[PDB]
Amino acid sequence: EVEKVATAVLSTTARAKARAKKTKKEKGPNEEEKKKEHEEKEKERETNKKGIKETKENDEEFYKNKYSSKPYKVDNMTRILPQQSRYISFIKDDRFVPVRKFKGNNGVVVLRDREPKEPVALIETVRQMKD
Amino acid sequence: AAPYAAKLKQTENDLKDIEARIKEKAGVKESDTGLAPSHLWDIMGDRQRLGEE
Amino acid sequence: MVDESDKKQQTIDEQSQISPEKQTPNKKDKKKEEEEQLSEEDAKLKTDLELLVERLKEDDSSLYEASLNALKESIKNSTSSMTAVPKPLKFLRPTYPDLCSIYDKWTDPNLKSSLADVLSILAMTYSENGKHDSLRYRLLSDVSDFEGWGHEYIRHLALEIGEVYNDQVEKDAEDETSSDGSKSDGSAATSGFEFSKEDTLRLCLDIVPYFLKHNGEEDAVDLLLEIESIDKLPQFVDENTFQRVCQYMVACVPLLPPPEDVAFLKTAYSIYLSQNELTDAIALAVRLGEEDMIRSVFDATSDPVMHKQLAYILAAQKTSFEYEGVQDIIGNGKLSEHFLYLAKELNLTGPKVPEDIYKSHLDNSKSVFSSAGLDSAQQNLASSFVNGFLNLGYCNDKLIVDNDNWVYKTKGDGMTSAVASIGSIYQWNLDGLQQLDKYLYVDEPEVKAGALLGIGISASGVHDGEVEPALLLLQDYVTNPDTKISSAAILGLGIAFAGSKNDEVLGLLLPIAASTDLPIETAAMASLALAHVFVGTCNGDITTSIMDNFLERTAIELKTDWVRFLALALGILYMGQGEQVDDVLETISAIEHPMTSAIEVLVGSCAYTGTGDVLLIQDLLHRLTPKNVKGEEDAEIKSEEKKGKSSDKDATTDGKNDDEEEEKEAGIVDELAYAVLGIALIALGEDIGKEMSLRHFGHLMHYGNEHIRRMVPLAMGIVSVSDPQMKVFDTLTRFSHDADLEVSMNSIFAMGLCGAGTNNARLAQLLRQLASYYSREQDALFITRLAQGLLHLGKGTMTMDVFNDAHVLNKVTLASILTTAVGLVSPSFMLKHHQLFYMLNAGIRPKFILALNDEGEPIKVNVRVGQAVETVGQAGRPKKITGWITQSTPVLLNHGERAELETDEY
Amino acid sequence: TRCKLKLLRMERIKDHLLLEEEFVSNSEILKPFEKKQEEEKKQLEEIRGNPLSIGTLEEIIDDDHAIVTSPTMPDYYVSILSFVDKELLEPGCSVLLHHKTMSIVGVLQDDADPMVSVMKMDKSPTESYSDIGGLESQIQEIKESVELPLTHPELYEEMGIKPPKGVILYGAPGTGKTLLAKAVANQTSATFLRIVGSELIQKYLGDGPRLCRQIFKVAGENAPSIVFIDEIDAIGTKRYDSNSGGEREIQRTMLELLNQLDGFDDRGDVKVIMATNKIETLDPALIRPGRIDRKILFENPDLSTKKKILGIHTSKMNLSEDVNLETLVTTKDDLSGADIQAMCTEAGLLALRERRMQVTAEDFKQAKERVMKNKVEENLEGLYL
Amino acid sequence: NVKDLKASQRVCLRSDSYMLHKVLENKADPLVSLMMVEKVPDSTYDMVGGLTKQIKEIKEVIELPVKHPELFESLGIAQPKGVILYGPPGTGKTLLARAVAHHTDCKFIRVSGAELVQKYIGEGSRMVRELFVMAREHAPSIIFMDEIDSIGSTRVEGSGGGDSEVQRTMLELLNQLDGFETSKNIKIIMATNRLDILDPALLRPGRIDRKIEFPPPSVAARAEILRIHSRKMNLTRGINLRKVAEKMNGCSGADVKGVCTEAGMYALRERRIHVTQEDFELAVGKVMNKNQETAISVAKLFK
């Protein structure tokens, strides 16, 4: 719908060209003498904007690392593809530290809380909401 | 050969446009045989066909 | 080619083909060492010039490139163009071709670009000397033949063209731009342009249209006048000079908008005036449409000669030709003042003499009737109008009319139009008034009203010289307070006088056309008449018409028909102007309503005419908008909307028609298509829109003067039998009329098939019947054109009533209007002092061959036809005079003009 | 230069403008297909199907039925159906029948045939008058008959006699009657149909006459018209074999043409040009002398005439500066313009053979020798001596 | 699509509804089937002996319009609308048309005999006419439509005969070729024995362009026709080549050829390969026998 009307405007200006070379000489002064549209730069015209709805992903450039080696913060409760799980390490800066070692795999993992007496938000299960 | 050759290039654009129109047009093919009062005919016509004579 | 040293002078030329020794080593070293040796260089300049001339014949790129390679360097590298000031300046003559050898003979993209700029600078500096002119000249008139110079010389000419065009596009101008590096004006390049123009006018045609067009000033054109008027007869004949002037105007008409377009054509008129033929002068003066220019040529023959001579007769003929009658009014009364003879002179200017010549033509053409014999109901009404349509122009069919039987059987609005049709039998004739008079003093008011319409039509051929003017009769009726009587009266007055804005005619129509508070449907005729009067001449854009339109919108909106007619009347009024019409678009748009927007698109067409290409695209975006807005969403109102839609369709066609006739010359084959694609679109898209575009299409063709007339009306017609509104056929036939019995041959069968075949409503039948009779006039009695015929770029004033009627659904009331269809063309005859009514011979040719003119001056070969033939329409229009064969010299050149021939026999 | 520039101006704006307007419109049409349109096009497909067999409409029976004749040997009694009615049809028109169950489902041909294509031409003739130059007196029999009533039928009405009707070009080969037919029709200003009568001969049955019938229907639409049936001599009376025949259809075709001469209404507005070698190459059964009017008799160019013809040819011929026209005329005796045409071409061939650009007078004699060669007559001095 | 589809494009179809499959740029014509067995000629200028004048004329006729249609027009006028070969039998006119066409580099189709012969896909009473079309397709192409003629004088009168009509129709067509794709590039070489037995439409001089009589061969020509067969055979001992040529001169290149074969009957029997003067003397005596006997009856016992 967007392209139909963007192509409309542009094609009309192109056709008018041959007549336009000599017209354009008279057109310049008649704007200074009479009046202008709302701008005083050139005569600049419309261009129309086209419809692009999708913002596509490119592809990697590094297949040797698809997981770099740089740090990135990954939030708890997120999509975790098994490649990431190997490099997940629980940080000590938080209260929360694993009871044992971490498996290097995804799953339900229970942690030891050093301060459970300090307010942290907690994420309600479905069952909790209903109560 | 300036007096015709300069401006000849401009005409070649015009010939090209004459090429572009015929194909642009030929892309769109639709009917109808008859007119609006004979669009009624077909609703009847369906029936008279299913009958054998 | 190969070097063979200094053995003889022949082999010196061969030596310098590979390596010059008198232009490269010696000279180079000489310049870079001693400065006593500047004296040796000066003598050696002449020698160097000769070596270029001898080797001009050689065309090969390699042996000019390499040879002059180190000279090209020396400009900035060693000489630096100021090691001896005067001396390198005057030695720039051999070095200037060296630069051009890398521009044009060798193509290296990097150097070809760069040295274009260098060439412009050095051209300017060396044109101070005036020797850069002489440099151009030796290649323009040539000395040697080679492919090479013919490609080289141009580059020099193009430098000038480059800068001058650029000063308009980019406001900064001068040498501030590095695209030329040369100043736009100043007394160093201006004198160069004048001298250049002289040489290139004689031998070429090149830079002369480019320069005029390039200054953007009428001043450029007025310089052109001086040089050409010297050339007018001794250098070459009058005729050759004319083709140069009028082609500037027909050719540089384009890409001129209004204020310029008038100003360029002023100068062309003046060139013609200066030259021998005043015949060329009158044609251009009519074109401008200014009162002032008409008077000067008429005065030029009339005033200086005391004696009657040829001069008084010639003046009268020239003004007579326009059947607008704009020239007629102005030229009259000078004849009275001078007083050699009143009687011959006054009559000859008037369209009274045109009545008399028609009788001679009619004698050949005879009378053949074919009118419908049908009677009773609406078929009675159909037949009685049809009789008038077949007997258009002066015809004698008195006895049929005098049988009052069929006349009295018309009823209602039919009575009014029946009396009006009787008037068209005696169209362009003094006698006929008698038949009208009978009805006018008896029975119901309906026949009284119809009599007044008929007076209008009859009075077309006699309204000048104060010999029974339409004004005289019709004034009494305006006074009478009845609406039907008064409305009919002022309609007929407008038709008869046409483009004439005489004091009595105009000033009667001046207090009136200012009541629209009272709701009267038939008060359309109030503005409609005044609009018709205005066309044919420059327009004041009268304050009477503008005021009443606004007032009508305030008062009513109930009568949809009334406001639709009113809108058209404004747009037709403004015709005959375009400069002033830019102003009034804004004035109308000041007060804004959706109803007012309908008026605006019509008036845009007239304002922008003669440059419409911004107009064209606009009238297509307009079409789009209803559908378009709905499109986005998918993924009181009644009167305003309908007026909106209809106006646009009409406007699109009107814009188109005027443009294709005037600017650009060729495109007339395609526009007929610019419309078809519009129609195709509309038929699917909007159901309502399709109805309007059908009717408009026929008048598109008639106004536009299409070359093709066989294929397109007939083919469109078949699709349109089917589609509602049989008024489509009436509009097609006005084009198809052509030269009768050529185009109209196909037409009678084609229109007759649908009409005779299908009867399913006597209403539908009526439109079809009228159209068929219109198309043919028996035996090419007359032709109708929208165009003046005097100019084929022209446009009439009598045919504007035809153009008006195709904007509305068919109505019985509209039938009364359609009786009027005036627009006659006279058949040329060779005149004498005793007013000879026979032409001797003419050449006619279907297609002009000339490709120096677009209009095409008639060929001198032609194909010969006899005496006393009608001036043929399309496929016959170029007409040359055979009269030369009789020791007769035309006084009045005729190219297929309307104008009657006049000859002087030795 | 400027004459170019002006044309350039007009022709670019009209073409270019149009392309953009067509280009947008194809989209503007297709987006809305809601309401009336979708319904209409849909019904038309359903009633139809695929494939569709060509048919021909012989007649309509007044009960919404018709008699049709297929390209297959059978013929069939069908119903009239769809958007195309019997009011919208006319007999003799080609019509679309649905294959499986024969019923008229439509039309798209609308009486378009490979014979119809050849006959059609509504454009002016190629030759204009005295291309065709000269046989002036012969033109001054064809023009009388053919040009004059079309131009003004009035003349005959004042004269008080029936108008002319047709002409029979007959007599000598090689006078250009096949060219001449063209020359006149240009001058008049009328539509010019041209069909070769050899294509009205068919080995299929009832097809012969259908092809003759199409001609007069077309002629009447585009009236005034001059119809050239080229070679009516080629319908002739001939026979392929007499032991498997072929000589039946010839008669039925000849007959269908004799009837529409007069029988397509008494008009000189439906003119015919019949070119024939002689009258005794035709079927001897004939219409009466005034129905065909004047018979135009071509005979051999005389001495003056063949100067004219010769002169036309040799202007076209390049590099003949050593030829003088008169001397060619002296040696030759009376002959067609046909053989002048050949002599000029044989003279280029000789001079091309020799490899010499020039064309001599001497050259031409050699060409006379070749053409005249086998016309020799020694019984001329058999009588004289 | 309708876009891909042009007029005169041959297309493949189904039996169940006739829906398209593929475009074909191949063409199956009764003309194509005749070409296909024969294929190209092996003839060259020297396969045909003698006929010295005839070779030189016909190079200009056949080659030059094809290669340069403009040159042919510039120096002289027009283009040929045909070539007609006639002369006595055995002259080798059929062999000539094969000879020249080799060098021309075009598809020498020939077409043997009458063309009413097709009937097994349908009649031959319009493949004459449509020949115009078929030939155009297979450009650049040379049509050797042969018909030796035995129609006589009977149907020259009028323009009778149904064979003559169809031939006439093709000829009416035939003009259009100078205009239907510009100039000529396809030669219509007709071959008939004489002008008396000829068809009416082909009759008058230059009516189908180019009337070329083929002479009976001279003694010098007979000797050259003999020259080439000698290599093919075993070369004579004693060079007695001139003997044959002096003794008789024929009316055909066939009579010359007749000597070669006749000569090898006698050599074969003697059981000597090489041809000799004696083998020659027997061979010319045998071929001349046929002719002496009909020549003694007007040479003796006459008036």
Ligand SMILES: Nc1ncnc2c1ncn2[C@@H]1O[C@H](COP(=O)(O)OP(=O)(O)OP(=O)(O)O)[C@@H](O)[C@H]1O
């Ligand atoms: N009037 C003419 N002026 C110029 N050339 C002519 C003229 N008349 C005939 N010729 C030449 O002679 C040729 C032969 O004429 P054309 O083909 O019309 O013959 P025809 O009389 O119809 O014979 P047929 O009996 O075979 O139908 C023309 O093509 C033309 O070149």
Ligand SMILES: Nc1ncnc2c1ncn2[C@@H]1O[C@H](COP(=O)(O)OP(=O)(O)OP(=O)(O)O)[C@@H](O)[C@H]1O
């Ligand atoms: N010039 C030649 N050189 C060699 N052989 C020859 C020559 N001319 C003819 N012949 C022989 O004579 C035979 C018959 O000649 P061919 O059948 O080609 O004759 P034609 O003149 O075209 O006759 P027709 O009148 O039957 O069409 C050839 O097949 C060949 O064997």
Ligand SMILES: [Mg+2]
């Ligand atoms: Mg003929």
Ligand SMILES: [Mg+2]
């Ligand atoms: Mg043979």
